[PDB]
Amino acid sequence: KFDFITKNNLWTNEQRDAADKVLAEIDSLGLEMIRLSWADQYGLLRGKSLTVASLKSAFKEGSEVAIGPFFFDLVSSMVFNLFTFEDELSGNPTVVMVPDPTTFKVLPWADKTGWMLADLHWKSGEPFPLCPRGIMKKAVKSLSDEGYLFKCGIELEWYLTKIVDRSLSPESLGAPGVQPDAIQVQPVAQGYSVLLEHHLDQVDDIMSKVRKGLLELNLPLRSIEDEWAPSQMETTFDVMEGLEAADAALLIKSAIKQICSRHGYHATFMCKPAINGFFASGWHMHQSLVDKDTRKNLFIPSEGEVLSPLGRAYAGGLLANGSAASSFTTPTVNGYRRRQPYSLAPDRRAWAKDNKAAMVRVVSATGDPASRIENRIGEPGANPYLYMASQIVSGLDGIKNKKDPGELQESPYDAQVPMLPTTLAEALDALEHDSELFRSCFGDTFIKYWLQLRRSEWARFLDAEGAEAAEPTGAVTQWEQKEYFNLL
Amino acid sequence: DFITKNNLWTNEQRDAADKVLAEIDSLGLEMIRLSWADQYGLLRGKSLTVASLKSAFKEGSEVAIGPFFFDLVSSMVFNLFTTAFEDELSGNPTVVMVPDPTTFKVLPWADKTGWMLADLHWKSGEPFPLCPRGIMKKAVKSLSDEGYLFKCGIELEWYLTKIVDRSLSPESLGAPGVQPDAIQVQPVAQGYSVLLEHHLDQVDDIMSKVRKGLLELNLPLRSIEDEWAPSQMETTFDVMEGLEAADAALLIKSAIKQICSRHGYHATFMCKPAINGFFASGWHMHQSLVDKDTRKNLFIPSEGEVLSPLGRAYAGGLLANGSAASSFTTPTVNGYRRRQPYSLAPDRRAWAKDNKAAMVRVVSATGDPASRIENRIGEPGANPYLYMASQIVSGLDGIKNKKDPGELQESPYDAQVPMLPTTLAEALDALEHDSELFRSCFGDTFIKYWLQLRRSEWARFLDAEGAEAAEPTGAVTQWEQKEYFNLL
Ligand SMILES: Nc1ncnc2c1ncn2[C@@H]1O[C@H](COP(=O)(O)OP(=O)(O)NP(=O)(O)O)[C@@H](O)[C@H]1O
Ligand SMILES: Nc1ncnc2c1ncn2[C@@H]1O[C@H](COP(=O)(O)OP(=O)(O)NP(=O)(O)O)[C@@H](O)[C@H]1O
Ligand SMILES: [Mg+2]
Ligand SMILES: [Mg+2]
Ligand SMILES: [Mn+2]
Ligand SMILES: [Mn+2]
Ligand SMILES: [Mn+2]
Ligand SMILES: [Mn+2]
């Protein structure tokens, strides 16, 4: 068989050793299938399930796939002509999924099934420019080149509901460009009784299975918590690093959804479902930089500081680029329901010490290795690679250009600072009008592609619900429910 | 190491932490709940993994004070958005849950789950002033400084019902400041045949599970009894001491509710549910003081006495402060349904020997170490910490000022003594106009906070049902059912 991986130098020695160990574990465990997957532009896992023999072949030749998913939106509108590359963004070329053996997992909820991520490459051997994991890799290398590792604490809010109807009737299936029916669900608990232990116990018949699945995947689960709204959950994780953290967040969301569905439940990372009483869910990103060699947290402040100078410049970069990065931290139309004051979610580019109204909330103390920046702007349905890469790119831009975050705001909701985009369209406008950094770091081809795609989605939303409905405080529309509830 | 830096663990607590970690590993536990009682006595907190708990044994676990500024339906009674603290009572600072390893339990009804209480501290290291367990700690220390230990017999009445509908439909979930629907239930047995053995047998398929859970928690279960009303139960426990006794009462109520819910039943400590035929439930507090060194009961009477002089003065303090303490022993609007005569509940500040019509009932015999005071004023839904601490503070005040209870009442419902508050508002007035003692021991800030919070709750009740509805002999309102039935 042709060895595409060796010829194109796509595996490190570490990856090759891991490939040997992975095959040994597959044999020892008697696995029958190994999923080969990769995140699309929305963070959703696409790929194939291979047999053992086919995976062994893929460890030399890769596995061919079409780029179709990149040119579809969530309902398979054809945004880019698959029938008619970086210049025109058209066609259906074949790319090669090259497995990343360091990502291998055994999926506990499935029958004799393993799981692995793949990187997309042209048959020429070059990375596919639209691959979001590749964009995270570029961000990680840019940060390594400067002496730093990205340390990230994953804090995810989500909704846990019980399935009433999976909406499988032919009349509910939609069509290309036509949303299918949302799954029908029922809340699993009452709410507005935050952090209530009895809520944790009431849902633990299924939540214990979620917990066990996450632990058995060797994910660093830290806490399970009862959030404010009915059936709203929160799961946090211990600190992870760079690509691993992004891969982990991706797998975490996938595992929660799959386990829940296996038992007749529906988990969703849709920011604010159209269900009475459901409040918006957030994805706050906890971030620190550590020295590649000394492994010390370089954000730790001395006395009379809230952050080290380096951390202060990182925060400056987060603030300065918060509008341009908005479509990456907050990619869904529905995620902008959180862009309003008095929400404990951010409406403006302000930093503050421990104040949960700020976009950038600093949590720190002299000599404390937990000292960190929390960016509260993200939504749970964000693509982990694009979210984390936007954070790295913004913070590194702040360090290189010595950006100043300005004064810590005591009342962030009164701060005389730039407002954040209130709609996805505003976020795309902000990116278009301030595109240089993300063109340079994510790639010009990717930014062109991203703008075109997301704008087509906004146009669909506008056509279905009208401009008035985009107001963040307005009720969640049926378009949002039928776009995001089932898949995110 | 926040705990070591602030000297927050005794050497016994550190030894206990070692043992707790060893037991967690030996049993293969996967989750450990870290909880604390809020102002209503409800358990709030997080569920942590083994790794996260090990970290919390050094740095504690951060949590927001949100629950203290919410009422039972999450009315925002204090402004979480304006950064203040003890003068302003506003804001949303982060505090540190410091685990108390001496409280560790394995929860028998849950999957591989341990459980622990936590004390709330500012990040400066000082105790958080609104924390009710801390108020109990201060009462216990105040009592110890005088040479005494608090011995308490826990006697809880409650209702056992079978769930018909958990009221989980979106239209039933309420909203912040808006009560959700009560759970719908069915009685499990007829009543008005008190202490009937056949009733005990009829309910023992579920009551046996409650019994086993309490026994496996190593709680000193003493009796299970058929109380007067249909489906009304009573569970008593052998004598416990001080802070343990309060912690145990908290765990007892939580365990009863969780076991019952796990099996499709609803236990409630709501005083008098809006269910036809349900009579009011009480929490009589059996109390004695023991000498810290001799370990002897200092209430034991001589011949021609019903209590030693010390016990008689303690009783005097209980009576003298009974109106000011009313919101603590009887914090619920619904609990004042018991403030009426000919009820076997107290309507006045009278004491008597073995008369169940009195507030302070003496049970004693010459030289009998069971000699004690039973205060019949409390309701089952009381916060264990606030109820017990109010008792300690009142009795110690009686001792210090040599307060005289007056003459024993042969007919308490005809006694020439001050009447007890008949509404929560009256109880808050009594505390406000006579606050010095409870300000001195519970703290000014807590008393200011308590008054403001409970008055907002009374205002909600008044607006929903009118003043006319507060008359104790009136029917239980839907507001009471939708405020207390689900959570208490
Ligand atoms: N140095 C660090 N760098 C990055 N993340 C860190 C660091 N130290 C701690 N974390 C992470 O920070 C997160 C803490 O989140 P959590 O305990 O939910 O509190 P919070 O996010 O500060 N508050 P909240 O919005 O109110 O829920 C965890 O994911 C930790 O692993
Ligand atoms: N010295 C003591 N100090 C405190 N509590 C004690 C003491 N001796 C016994 N007790 C407790 O007193 C309680 C007695 O409760 P119980 O047997 O129900 O009595 P009762 O007063 O007759 N109740 P009731 O008939 O329902 O009104 C138990 O919780 C005992 O553990
Ligand atoms: Mg959190
Ligand atoms: Mg009794
Ligand atoms: Mn949260
Ligand atoms: Mn957070
Ligand atoms: Mn009784
Ligand atoms: Mn009694």
Author numbering:
A (entry chain A): 4 to 87, 92 to 495
B (entry chain E): 6 to 89, 92 to 495
Show sentences the authors wrote.
A glutamine synthetase-like (GS-like) enzyme (NpaA1) initiates 1NA glutamylation, and this enzyme exhibits a broad substrate selectivity toward a variety of anilines and naphthylamine derivatives. During γ-glutamylation of 1NA, the 1NA consumption (0.16 mmol) was almost equivalent to the total accumulation of γ-glutamylated 1NA (0.157 mmol). In view of the above analyses, NpaA1 was established as a γ-glutamylnaphthylamide synthase catalyzing ligation of 1NA and L-glutamate to form γ-glutamylated 1NA. The crystal structure of apo-NpaA1 and two complexes with substrates or substrate analogs were obtained. The binding pocket is located at the interface between adjacent subunits, and the bifunnel channel similar to GS protein refers to a structural feature characterized by two distinct channels that converge into the common active site.
When the ATP analog AMPPNP binds to NpaA1, an additional Mg2+ binds to the active site, facilitating the binding of the AMPPNP phosphate group. The coordinating residues involved in ATP, glutamate, and Mn2+ binding are highly conserved between NpaA1 and GS.
